[PDB]
Amino acid sequence: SVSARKIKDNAADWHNLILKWETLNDAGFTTANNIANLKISLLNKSSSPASKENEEKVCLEYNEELEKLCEELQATLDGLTKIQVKMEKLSSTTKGICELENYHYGEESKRPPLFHTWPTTHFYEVSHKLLEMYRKELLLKRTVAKELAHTGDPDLTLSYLSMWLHQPYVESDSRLHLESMLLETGHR
């Protein structure tokens, strides 16, 4: 049916947006990891006069590079924000498909599944759960990015850096929810 093709395409769209998210998150981690390491080197600053002079000049250039890296990290957040808005579109699309099915074919309890077993509303419930997770993850990343650029403790930097990569909200069950949609719709 037409709705089946739309739902299968919607699941594929979720896969592609989640891939773009991971691509940007990995790139952001590289940037965030460069900020942390330069910060720790800058924070590590009765030695020889040559060493003092050298350390002084090197640390001035650390500050310049750190400012460029922080702007680079903000650009990644901008890319992730664009993805999160596209995800809200995808969740809204799933919702609209459910509304189209109800109007054209009546009560869902009396319609057959589009594929194997899922009622069409279950696609929306899963889609909305994914949106909710990435909403929370994006909010957390702005705090992480803010802390990285201002924190002065190496250990905190590592903890925040670990949060950026592990993604406590997305890592919980993003894969399982996505996989269940791809499995039901017959994707690879």
Residue numbers in the entry: 17 to 61, 68 to 210
Can you provide the manuscript's text about this entry?
We show that SPATA5 and SPATA5L1 associate in a DNA-binding heterohexameric complex together with heterodimeric alpha-helical proteins C1orf109 and CINP. This chromatin-associated complex, which we name 55LCC, uses ATPase activity to process replisome substrates in S-phase, facilitating their proteolytic turnover from chromatin to ensure DNA replication and mitotic fidelity. SPATA5 and SPATA5L1 belong to the CDC48 family of type II AAA+ ATPases, which contain two ATPase domains separated by an intervening sequence and an N-terminal region that typically is used to specify protein-protein interactions. We propose that 55LCC acts as an unfoldase, thereby remodeling protein complexes and facilitating their subsequent cleavage by cysteine proteases and removal from chromatin.
While little is known about C1orf109, CINP was shown to interact with DNA replication factors and was required for genome stability. CINP required expression of all other subunits for its stability but loss of CINP did not substantially affect levels of the other three members. Notably, the individual CINP and C1orf109 structures observed in the 55LCC map were nearly identical to the structures solved by X-ray crystallography and predicted by AlphaFold 2. The cryo-EM structure adopted by the C1orf109-CINP sub-complex also closely matched the T-like structure predicted by AlphaFold-Multimer35 (r.m.s.d. = 2.94 Å). In agreement with these observations, recombinantly purified CINP and C1orf109 behaved as monomers in solution while the C1orf109-CINP complex formed a stable heterodimer with a 1:1 stoichiometry and a Mw of 49.7 kDa when analyzed by native mass spectrometry. By contrast, we observed no shift for the C1orf109-CINP sub-complex in the presence of any nucleic acids. We introduced mutations in interacting residues in both C1orf109 and CINP, and tested WT and mutant proteins in co-IP experiments. Similarly, corresponding mutations at the interacting CINP residues L162, S181, and S184 impaired CINP binding to SPATA5 and SPATA5L1. Conversely, mutation of the more distal residue L178, or the conserved PRKP and RKIK motifs located at the N-terminus of CINP, did not affect complex formation.
